[PDB]
Each structure stands twice: as C-alpha cells, then as structure tokens.
C-alpha cells in the first residue's frame, strides 16, 4: 500500500488526453 | 472514499455475523497445491479460441 | 542519573 500524509482522500491526478480541434 | 469504506465494512459484517452452512461452505476452499494442479489440467484442456476454431 | 549509575556499579564491586 501507499502512504498518505493527509487526513482525507483526494482524487489522484491521471492522464488527460487533450481535445482535438474539430472541423 | 465511500466505496472503499463500504467494501471493507462488508467483509467485517460477513465475519462478525453467523454464516449458515450453505454460504459458509464456500470459505472452505481446496488447498493450494491441489488447486494449482486442477487449474493446470483445466489450462491444458482450455477451449479453443476464436481464431483456432 | 550518572550519580545513580556510579553508585550502582560501586555497590556491585563492594558486594562482589
């Protein structure tokens, strides 16, 4: 398991593919 | 998170309460060595894939 | 604390 130094859980940052420019 | 707390609390409630034999029999599993041997035989006779068929 | 340790050791050598 990991280690959490904060008393509440927050959403981890994940990979975010950027939106493509539409025609 | 709520789902994390609930899935841990679910295991606690399953162990604290009185489990009837119909459900309790599934906690008395086959031993590891026999389980590995059985799954090896199953893998040997696995069904053919879409390609091979 | 050092005084107690020395007294304990001195008593040890005195008793033995």
């Amino acid at each position: 398991r990991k280690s959490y130094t904060r008393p509440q859980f927050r959403r981890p940052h994940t990979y975010r593919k950027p939106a493509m420019a539409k025609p | 998170p709520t789902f994390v707390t609930m899935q841990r609390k679910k295991r606690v409630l399953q162990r604290r309460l009185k489990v009837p034999p119909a459900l309790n029999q599934f906690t008395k599993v086959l031993d590891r060595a026999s389980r590995n041997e059985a799954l090896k035989l199953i893998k040997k006779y696995a069904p053919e894939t879409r390609k091979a068929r | 604390k050092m005084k107690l340790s020395h007294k304990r050791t001195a008593n040890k050598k005195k008793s033995k």
């Binding site: - | 009185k18 034999p21 026999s34 | -």
Partner: protein, 52 residues
C-alpha cells in the same frame, strides 16, 4: 484420478460436516485482546471461595 481423490477428501467425503458447519461469529483483534486482558485481570479473584 489423483485430482478426483484429492477433491473428494476435502468436499465429497466430508458432506455431513459441510452440511452442518455454521460460520462467522469471529471477533475482531481488538475485541479478542480486550477479552484476554479482562480474563487476566480477574484471573484469581475467586480463590477464597473455593473450599479446597
């Protein structure tokens, strides 16, 4: 054949036990520790009531 014999030892031949055995009723580690400590505290608080 060996696998059939092994699984029969655990499941088929033990049918009567499997049909009757209830599960659960397991205390937590903290509850088990608390019960053990309580028994130790009250270990010999009844020695004077024994005639022998």
């Amino acid at each position: 054949k060996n696998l059939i014999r092994s699984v029969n030892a655990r499941f088929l031949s033990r049918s009567d036990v499997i049909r009757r055995q209830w599960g659960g009723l397991q205390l937590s580690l903290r509850s088990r520790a608390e019960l053990r400590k309580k028994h130790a505290r009250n270990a010999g608080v009844d020695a004077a009531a024994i005639i022998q």
